[PDB]
Design a protein around this ligand. Structure first.
Ligand SMILES: NC(=O)c1ccc[n+]([C@@H]2O[C@H](COP(=O)(O)O)[C@@H](O)[C@H]2O)c1
Length: 312
């Protein structure tokens, strides 16, 4: 591809994607399906990779998420919330691996999890008590949704230990509830949600706590942000320590040594994809040890120690 072609094409792609980002991250009402958005974003990455000069501040590859809504107390994140690099093929995963084993200079162990179609949240605890629930917003300032998150049961008020921490995860709506809700939202004359994620988001990100409580929402915690007294050193460990202290966590997790294991994992759950009561849209491959995650660091937008495969 030529430079003169790229330039004008990137222009098309940035101009489109940032409108979609506004639709999705802000309004929670996307024009286009996800597999499309990923095609167009994947294209733009390739262009900006071939021609790093075309990278601009407002490129989607540079920001995370979107702005905060009007009537919602702001929720600053002392530790940033980031996005995640994506892959779509056997090819792409083996590549990640090779790049990671290069910069680390050895083979290393990955914790595999499922990618839940849900809304990212940040939960903050102090001496065991729940104190603030936050969206991601733009990675550094989200929205205070504490009063709404209270209506979601799997979210504990009191931990099993009187510890001060902050933990990150997804809040999703099960397929059953989802369909009931769209059906529910037709005799009303109201228009549907595109998917469980946008169902979850629209429920959580409005002001009327009473009708949030009428939806069926649930949670899975993925990551520890502020550890406080927590002793976990690896991701697989962390997950058990998250269950230990009283958080819901996805049991489908699997620690994989080699990457044939990882690929087999992805095979397996491609097949079990629609066996599950919640909509899954891919797998998450994380570097297991936290010091290794510290070694690779984050990009501007995402972690280098983690990739998210997407199904076709
Ligand atoms: N309008 C859209 O269709 C739209 C826009 C932005 C993100 N998404 C979804 O969100 C993902 C990216 O979210 P993260 O920022 O957490 O990586 C995409 O891969 C896609 O599944 C969809």
């Amino acid at each position: 591809l030529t430079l003169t072609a790229a330039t004008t094409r990137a222009q098309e792609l940035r101009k489109q994607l940032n409108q979609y980002d506004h639709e999705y991250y802000v309004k929670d009402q996307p024009s286009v399906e996800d597999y499309v958005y990923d095609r167009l974003y994947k294209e733009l990455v390739d262009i900006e990779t071939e021609f790093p000069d075309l990278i601009t501040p407002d490129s989607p590859t540079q920001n995370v998420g979107g702005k905060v809504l009007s009537g919602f107390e702001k929720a600053p994140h002392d530790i940033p919330m980031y996005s995640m690099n994506r892959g779509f093929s056997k090819e792409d995963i083996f590549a990640f691996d090779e790049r990671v084993r290069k910069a680390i200079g050895k083979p290393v162990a990955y914790c595999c999890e499922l990618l839940i179609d849900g809304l990212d949240i940040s939960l903050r605890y102090e001496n065991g008590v729940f104190v603030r629930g936050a969206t991601r917003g733009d990675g550094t300032v989200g929205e205070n949704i504490t009063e709404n998150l209270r209506t979601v049961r799997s979210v504990p008020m009191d931990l099993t230990e009187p510890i001060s921490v902050e933990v990150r995860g997804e809040c999703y709506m099960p397929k059953q509830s989802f369909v009931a809700l769209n059906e529910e939202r037709e005799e009303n004359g109201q228009d549907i949600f595109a998917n469980p994620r946008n169902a979850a988001a629209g429920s959580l990100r409005q002001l009327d706590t009473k009708i949030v409580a009428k939806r069926n929402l649930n949670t899975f915690l993925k990551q520890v942000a502020d550890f406080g007294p927590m002793k976990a050193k690896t991701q697989f460990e962390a997950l058990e320590e998250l269950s230990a202290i009283g958080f819901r966590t996805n049991p489908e997790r699997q620690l994989c040594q080699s990457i044939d294991e990882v690929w087999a994992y992805i095979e397996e759950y491609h097949e079990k994809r629609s066996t599950l009561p919640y909509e899954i849209n891919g797998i998450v491959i994380k570097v297991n040890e936290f010091a290794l995650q510290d070694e690779l660091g984050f990009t501007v937008k995402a972690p280098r120690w983690a990739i998210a495969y997407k199904f076709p």
